[PDB]
Write a protein that binds this DNA or RNA. Sequence first.
DNA 1: ATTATGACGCT
DNA 2: AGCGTCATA
Length: 430
Amino acid sequence: GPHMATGQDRVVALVDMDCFFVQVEQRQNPHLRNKPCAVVQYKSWKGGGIIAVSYEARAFGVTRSMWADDAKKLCPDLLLAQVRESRGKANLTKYREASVEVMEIMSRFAVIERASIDEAYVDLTSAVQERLQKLQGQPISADLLPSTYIEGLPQGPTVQKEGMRKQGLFQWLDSLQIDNLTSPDLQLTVGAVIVEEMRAAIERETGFQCSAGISHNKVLAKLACGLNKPNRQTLVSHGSVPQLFSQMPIRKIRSLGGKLGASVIEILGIEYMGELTQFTESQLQSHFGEKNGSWLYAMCRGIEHDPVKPRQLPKTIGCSKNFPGKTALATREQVQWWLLQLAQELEERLTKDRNDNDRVATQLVVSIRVQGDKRLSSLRRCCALTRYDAHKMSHDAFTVIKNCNTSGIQTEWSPPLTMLFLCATKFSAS
DNA sequence: ATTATGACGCT
DNA sequence: AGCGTCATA
Ligand SMILES: [Mn+2]
Ligand SMILES: [Mn+2]
Ligand SMILES: [Mn+2]
């Protein structure tokens, strides 16, 4: 009754860029704008691997992970932009720098949690309270929410898409109680007003379009964001959760897209998020552990407490390269050459990081994969990182992996290496 | 032969 | 610590 927590204490948004690497390349090259377009890495093997796809290209069935040669079969006029290569490897600096542009704008509105290269969570609870105190109990005009969808509306007693959006927004606004500064639905609405402002600023100041979700926690905000991509934002209210979740595959919820989610489906014999409500918290804990069980019990009711962390910068800086098929490294000179290439890119990024962000990494993690191992990583070893010097770091990395060579001979490396990974970690203020 | 990342959980 | 899981361009 009066004591059941409803998880409506916060206003949380998730802002996610549309087709982000494609937009970065479209800004740079106007010829790519408003075209079926994709971003590819490498080229020699099957035309290269696609890692981002414009919405025009998606209409032809082009997806991420697709080889460009195969994408061209679906979409002959597909335009491509290639990821930069430096020191023999893909280099993602352009996209990291574009990300910083977006993150710095968002940070003007609230403290953000960088969740990927192209998205961040915002806790807007305080900003909403402030905007509410200025407003005076005026109704919120539809004109303040020009790109907002209200999930679940319209409903009850037009054949165009923008028409439907407005109908839902109208129903939503008319149901509001703007007289109550503690009403969660009102708080979400004001959150959505602020996010319109945020998204307008991002587009004005970078040229990049994005989508967003507004809800009471990170999982619902993330889910909401995807509902009306691209270039739109979606409000998912607490009240909208039972209908939304009644047909929502469990795998769609963040963190349930892998083995845990599959086990929820298999063990319980269910399909949709809403079906979880019929289990006790103890039942869920018995199957999925104490933490997962409590999390699922609350999550299927729309409730989650994971805070928006105040962290705008990545906490690791890493350099990685695969050596697939017959390109696997089989000599000492090869292994050392590539460790140096990775280490030189790492030095570059680390030095820039120290100057920009007043911090220094203190641990170097070295990871390799061996031919025959299905696992992402075969071996991970750490050592000290005391100087930002590529030759030292590459010499150190070789030392910690040296004993992995099962070859009797010194000159050969066996079994051949199919991945090298250098990562700088454990930052301290400097 | 999707690749290049990056956060967090477990023991 | 080293490994595993999950995630995103
Ligand atoms: Mn995106
Ligand atoms: Mn994203
Ligand atoms: Mn994506």
